[PDB]
From Swiss-Prot, chains A, B:
Homohexamer; disulfide-linked. Trimer of homodimers, with three symmetric intersubunit disulfide bonds linking the dimers to one another. Optimum temperature is 120 degrees Celsius. Highly thermostable. Pathway: Purine metabolism; purine nucleoside salvage. GO terms for biological process: nucleoside catabolic process. The lineage of its organism: Archaea, Thermoproteota, Thermoprotei, Sulfolobales, Sulfolobaceae. This is Purine nucleoside phosphorylase. CDD domains: MTAP_SsMTAPI_like (cd17764). It comes from Saccharolobus solfataricus (strain ATCC 35092 / DSM 1617 / JCM 11322 / P2) (Sulfolobus solfataricus). GO terms for molecular function: S-methyl-5-thioadenosine phosphorylase activity. A purine D-ribonucleoside binds at residues 3, 161, 178-180, 202-203. Belongs to the PNP/UDP phosphorylase family. It is an enzyme of class 2 (transferase). Pfam families: PNP_UDP_1.
Length: 227, 227, 228, 228, 228, 228
């Protein structure tokens, strides 16, 4: 690996991945005896224990190309189970800020990354691991957290203008928008990794509280990863 | 509707759809007081009761264009919950004939039907309803039936040659191949219908028993539809 | 053959194909000593005589994927000449219901089935056999039938919305819309089959006993051609 | 028009179009009282009479973009019937040099010009006028000329390499390759012009005086069609 | 080569290419002892000397397919440095008629020719040779000519309608529109040829003697570059 | 600004952008009185003085989507001139590690980000600012640095397999591969920003203190340009 310079054996098979290095540092406090196994290029990776299992929390940056690199290198270091925990913008009015979205699929616009990996324009089903996703539903249920299950649109251009953005994607079965799920799911299906994703709603495009929301969700994810 | 000439009120909200008219006729025997509500164009539709609920068994023919027409017309007649029960060819060697595949997603090649409905080439997540799919897992589990959960490739050309067919689609996360799921899932997401799919493995591309397999599975599906 | 379960020699070289199994049965009454050679999966196929010539009438269901399977299997059983006889919706105001359209080509949206067969997105000319199409014209005009010759758009989504549908496809040279011609024409060119298509106008997007008479009359004309 | 500087009334409704300006000059000798109505940008356009009808012979250069400009401008000058008479390379073994191909359709790769005119990547049927094409057949047969009727692949890159070129396109139902057919047909369909095409086989990818005679003989049959 | 019938040794390594055969003839007067080395298919090619260097001026017709054929054949005859000197329509208000645009890149719609050469739909950077382009700038500045440096949109359909044409392409970083740049640049990149382009603004989509002078003055600056 | 949380006036008009936050910090030592204006989400931005000129050094992370967000937000904060300084893998054998490549254009696969910004699949010329790029050349040559000028392929999949990778992209005119240039160039053209790119060759796909010296030396040259 040329980006994640962690020593082999410093990355766990189970990894909770987040886009913000700051969130990785903040969530590492949930682990027992957290150790920083990587700092290169800002991709903070911490490894420690939780519920009797070794677990790692890694930073994936923003966008499909960035998360693809991070997943590929973590996998080369031994990782095979990934659960992305990020922030999203709801596309439907009934979802409130701070609530969660357990992703069942990702819509995406055909693009370079998918073409380079798939070798053609086939719309390969970009879905998470079935079992893993159900365990997440179980963990969030056990902790009495309010969540919704559904597809998300994985956008590549945060600032590109689209006057019909919300209507378009919500009418296509998506309840939220973010930027890395399609890559995570598809690459995982091709590579054989087990992946899933839960998102914290930080904004609603159709319409300290957030801090706690982020922490509560992270605990649910770690429970799932170590279940 | 111009194809399914069923009278309004003759089609239930819950519909089990199969491609073969013969299978529809054969499965109608599982309903209480089955009535033929449509015969036009060979699209046999039967309506009756099961576990205290009105249910319909409809024929959708072969291919996305055919199933799209049938779903659209059944929906115009009141249907909003669809569960496709079909036959498939496994893409992985560990699945045996007669076993079942509970579909979690559908890979497809971009094409006319998807372009006409979506209005562009976006790879909209073609997934079934989460809840419904889990109920299917529950019903097949309760009846001790051997199943596998995973994505399928919805092909449009049964006889088109592809020397690397099995390797290609299996390496893309698909465990089986059929022809209508992608259309069913995507159209359902756009229209707001609740859909799912279970397939009976009749052949394995990587490698009276079938009769019973078909019947046993159908009972599991009807249980799900009326749960 | 996985869908059409007919035996060796039951399927004729020349086949009149229709989408509706009801029409296959109905038209089978125009033949001499018709034999139901297949009914599996609803794909009714009949083989009888017309003008002392053996021919078959087969059901192809709705859509490209469906007709592709049927043609492939019929071909495996001996068929090599196919004339589709179906229903269409006119895209021009001057065409009346019950009249006919003799198809000269088919417009289509790329992808799906075409990509799997062609291996890329090239727009291969989707046209019927020149000779066979001219024989249909002679046959129809001979029976004093009202027909129009032109291209059609082969749609894959009967109910997909398009507020510019009519203007769009008519401005592109298509005079009617149906769903199987592009598949029938392209697959035939690739497999080496002789194909053509005649459509009965059952609706006019630009605008029961009578329609069945229209169907029956055109059927005779088509059968004349398939046995000429 | 900025390329074809002919004045209104100098271009006929009926136009025989050729890619080579040298061919236009050579064929103008078949008209009665031929007059050069344009030479700008090398696009030679002659106008004269034939069989009691006014006809023009125009140069279209090489490629879809070039023929598109020429057709658009001739049309703005009153032209509405076009018959392209070009040269082609056969894709099948049985067609001999000097023989003709009457075109029934054109296969083509999507993109560029087609996207700009059609506004999306739909594979619109690229076919010639049915009536006009049959007349060409009648005229070539009436002059006892050897012709074959079939589709052609309209290539945009004469020199792009493709190892399986001949097999790929012939297996797709095309019997020859050239570069302007698809553009002519599709654009004519969109603009409402009546077009057709006959090609002289100058090479066979599957397998001088005699050629000039071939070119001359075919030109006469085309002119007969244009004036019928 | 089947279009450019010049013999080896008759085409120079350095070639100034223009779309109009009339322009090639007019510019040949700038060379010393100009000799016509080809006129086949109207593609006029002159070869002479300039600044102690042998240079050819060749006609490329209109459109990517046409220029592709000409470049390929000239290259087979020994050419390896090409500078296109054409006419263009400005897409921005501030550029005046008769002024020049030194091209730094070409936007284009995928498909056809690009797909056949590149083998897929990748957006390969369509840029001119860096060194040669800077020399053009130096030469135009040395002759006190008004030029602007920027990208252009290489259109394939001169007459296709697009309501927001000017705003769309100017908002995409293009300052003018023409039809051969993208093909020239990309093909040169693939074949290893050194190419560049200067355009004379003959129209402004955003807003005779004076023009000929403009054309002549720019031709001299281009010839200086080619021989430097 | 959602990611770069800097205040009004902290971000300079001219910005040197790098993908690695470690390099941003390291290079910030070349400035006078450097101030860390942002560290949110790891996107370190420093604003200091160079040759008595205010400039900023910003982190853009890896990939098109990441750099697009950073550029958009920096622009919202006052930035309008961007020079990317990164690392690349040469696609040609004659380029040594530690040497530099001054980018003249970027090849890319269509889709994703480009489709969302451009609204269709047009291959818009992805080029840097002509003037700014020439100043980089002067700056590097002035400091006696070994550089090569050419196009690069902006890949989105660092680890995707392609057994023909090197031959494919080098045959298409690219001399190196990285991941952000196409995005930087196209977005800049659309938004009206002046951009350029210089890359340090850290690997040769066609074949520690030394690399850091290479990085530091080139950084000075780039900073000279941004403050010229």
């Amino acid at each position: 690996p040329v980006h994640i310079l962690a020593k082999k054996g410093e990355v766990a098979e189970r990894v909770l991945v987040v886009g913000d290095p700051g969130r990785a540092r903040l969530l590492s406090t949930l682990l027992q005896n957290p150790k920083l196994t990587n700092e290169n290029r800002g991709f903070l990776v911490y490894t420690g224990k939780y519920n009797g299992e070794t677990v790692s929390i890694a930073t994936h940056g923003i966008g499909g190309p960035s998360i693809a690199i991070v997943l590929e290198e973590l996998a080369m270091l031994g990782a095979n189970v990934f659960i992305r925990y990020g922030t999203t913008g709801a596309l439907v009015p009934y979802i409130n800020l701070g609530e969660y979205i357990i992703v069942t699929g990702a819509s995406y616009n055909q693009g370079g990354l998918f073409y380079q990996y798939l070798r053609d324009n086939a719309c390969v089903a970009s879905t998470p691991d079935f079992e893993l996703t159900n365990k997440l539903v179980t963990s969030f249920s056990k902790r009495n957290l309010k969540y919704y299950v559904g597809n998300v649109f994985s956008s590549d251009a945060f600032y590109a203008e689209d006057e019909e953005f919300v209507k378009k994607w919500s009418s296509r079965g998506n309840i939220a928008v973010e930027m890395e799920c399609a890559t995570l799911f598809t690459l995982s299906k091709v590579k054989g990794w087990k992946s899933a994703t839960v998102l914290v709603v930080s904004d609603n495009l159709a319409k300290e509280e957030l801090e706690k929301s982020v922490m509560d969700g992270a605990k649910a994810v770690l429970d799932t990863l170590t279940s």
